Scaffold this active site. Structure first.
Site, short mmCIF file in Angstrom:
data_model
loop_
_atom_site.label_atom_id
_atom_site.label_comp_id
_atom_site.label_asym_id
_atom_site.label_seq_id
_atom_site.Cartn_x
_atom_site.Cartn_y
_atom_site.Cartn_z
N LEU A 36 0.82 -1.21 0.00
CA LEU A 36 0.00 0.00 0.00
C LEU A 36 0.85 1.27 0.00
O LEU A 36 0.35 2.37 -0.21
CB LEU A 36 -0.94 0.01 1.21
N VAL A 62 3.99 -0.93 4.46
CA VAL A 62 2.57 -1.16 4.69
C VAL A 62 1.94 -2.01 3.60
O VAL A 62 1.98 -1.65 2.42
CB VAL A 62 1.81 0.17 4.80
N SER A 113 8.15 2.16 8.25
CA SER A 113 7.47 0.88 8.05
C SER A 113 7.17 0.58 6.58
O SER A 113 7.22 1.47 5.72
CB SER A 113 6.16 0.85 8.84
N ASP A 137 1.52 13.76 15.61
CA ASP A 137 1.81 13.58 14.19
C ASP A 137 0.54 13.70 13.36
O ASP A 137 0.32 12.94 12.41
CB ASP A 137 2.48 12.23 13.94
N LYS A 152 6.92 5.92 6.59
CA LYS A 152 8.05 6.62 7.18
C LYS A 152 9.01 5.65 7.87
O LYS A 152 10.21 5.63 7.57
CB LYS A 152 7.56 7.68 8.18
N1 JRJ Z 1 1.87 12.07 -2.94
C1 JRJ Z 1 1.77 10.98 -3.80
C2 JRJ Z 1 0.79 9.91 -3.45
C3 JRJ Z 1 1.30 8.70 -2.73
C4 JRJ Z 1 1.19 8.66 -1.15
N2 JRJ Z 1 0.18 7.85 -0.58
C5 JRJ Z 1 0.13 7.38 0.71
C6 JRJ Z 1 -1.11 6.58 0.82
C7 JRJ Z 1 -1.67 5.81 2.08
C8 JRJ Z 1 -1.41 4.37 2.22
N3 JRJ Z 1 -1.97 3.73 3.47
N4 JRJ Z 1 -3.14 3.26 3.56
C9 JRJ Z 1 -3.32 2.76 4.86
C10 JRJ Z 1 -4.44 2.10 5.57
BR1 JRJ Z 1 -6.01 1.80 4.65
C11 JRJ Z 1 -4.29 1.72 6.88
BR2 JRJ Z 1 -5.74 0.84 7.87
C12 JRJ Z 1 -3.08 1.97 7.55
BR3 JRJ Z 1 -2.88 1.44 9.38
C13 JRJ Z 1 -1.95 2.64 6.83
BR4 JRJ Z 1 -0.24 2.99 7.76
C14 JRJ Z 1 -2.08 3.01 5.54
N5 JRJ Z 1 -1.29 3.61 4.63
N6 JRJ Z 1 -1.70 6.66 -0.48
N7 JRJ Z 1 -0.95 7.38 -1.25
#
Ligand code: JRJ
Ligand code: CL
Length: 331
Positions: free
Chosen positions: A44, A52, A50, A155, A48
């Protein structure tokens, strides 16, 4: 002469009145499950501290999110877990489903409930005036709860707010920087993200509290209603203060410094200079006026203060006229 001490206006002694094991997270015993109970489906993102992954629980065939922790002090891991366990069941707080290690690498991993999230780079440009008020209210529910549970998030930023817009549900995630508030404790000022760092972090004032999150909320609100991301666009920690000073003015800034007897870094004296406190109408233009209202500006103004003691609490914020329609509809 050292800095003048500070206490939180609200939830000041909540941790003291709880059992030691509630906040003394170093002594917490962790029961590690097996990662083999989860199959990773896809990545996903590269977090920072980790990696995911979206995963499925092969036991009951349910979708989860596996957060493989990057190598940090065990103390900090126990902190995040204990805080997550203490807050579980809370409003708009992410739910920690499980805690596992990989059978081979023995690397710690956190398992969370799944959220159908749309990134704010795609979502926030579509939100209506009501959507902002609604989701701001949801975050406040989360902030008020964790603050009442004696916990600073430290944060708060869009990337740590998962939004399922289709089901209008919101989850505050990533509690790896979160910490228990204790009156008198001097905390590390190297927390939060640069664009969301409160002034107290920038001037290195260590005795802060929950009000830190309220500043970060203010930075978020400003970027949303003005459609300017980020709102305080500094190139470093020093210039960040300059960016803020060019908006909130330098007069309140130096008064803030004088009030808490803060020894200002010798670097700041030249770059800060002298700036007036700007009116919010300056940031209002053709493309954002439909999100800006006199109530919004009033609410925003009471979040963005140098003096952390003078910022709204989460509960005070929820009682602001900006959310009057939202509160009514939720009844
Ligand atoms: N700026 C460019 C775009 C890319 C950055 N980006 C970050 C994300 C988020 C990804 N994500 N989804 C999560 C979920 Br659903 C859960 Br529940 C948890 Br816990 C975490 Br940590 C997550 N991180 N999308 N695009
Ligand atoms: Cl609060």
């Amino acid at each position: 002469s050292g800095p003048v001490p500070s206490r939180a206006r609200v939830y000041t002694d909540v941790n003291t009145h709880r059992p030691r094991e509630y906040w003394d997270y170093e002594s917490h015993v962790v029961e590690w499950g097996n990662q083999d109970d989860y199959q990773l489906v896809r990545k996903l993102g590269r977090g920072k501290y980790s990696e995911v992954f979206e995963a499925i629980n092969i036991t009951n065939n349910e979708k989860v999110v596996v957060k493989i922790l990057k190598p940090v002090k065990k103390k900090k891991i126990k902190r995040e877990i204990k805080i997550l366990e203490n807050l579980r069941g809370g409003p708009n707080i992410i739910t920690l489903a499980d805690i596992v290690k990989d059978p081979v690498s023995r690397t710690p991993a956190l398992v969370f409930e799944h959220v159908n999230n749309t990134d704010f780079k795609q979502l926030y440009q579509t939100l209506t005036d009501y959507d902002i008020r609604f989701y701001m209210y949801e975050i406040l529910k989360a902030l008020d709860y964790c603050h009442s549970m004696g916990i600073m998030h430290r944060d708060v930023k869009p990337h740590n707010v998962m939004i399922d817009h289709e089901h209008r549900k919101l989850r505050l995630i990533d509690w790896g920087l979160a910490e228990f508030y204790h009156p008198g404790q001097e905390y590390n000022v190297r927390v939060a993200s640069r664009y969301f760092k409160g002034p107290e972090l920038l001037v290195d004032y260590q005795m802060y509290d929950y009000s830190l999150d309220m500043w970060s909320l203010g930075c978020m609100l400003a970027s949303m209603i003005f459609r300017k991301e980020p709102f305080f666009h500094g190139h470093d920690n020093y210039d960040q203060l300059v960016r803020i000073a060019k908006v909130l003015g330098t007069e309140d800034l130096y008064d803030y410094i004088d009030k808490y007897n803060i020894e200002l870094d010798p670097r700041f004296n030249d770059i800060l200079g002298r700036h007036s406190r700007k009116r919010w109408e300056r940031f209002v233009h053709s493309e954002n006026q439909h999100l800006v209202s006199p109530e919004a500006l009033d609410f925003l103004d009471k979040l963005l203060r140098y003096d952390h003691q003078s910022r709204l609490t989460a509960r005070e914020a929820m009682e602001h006229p900006y959310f009057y329609t939202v509160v009514k509809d939720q009844a």
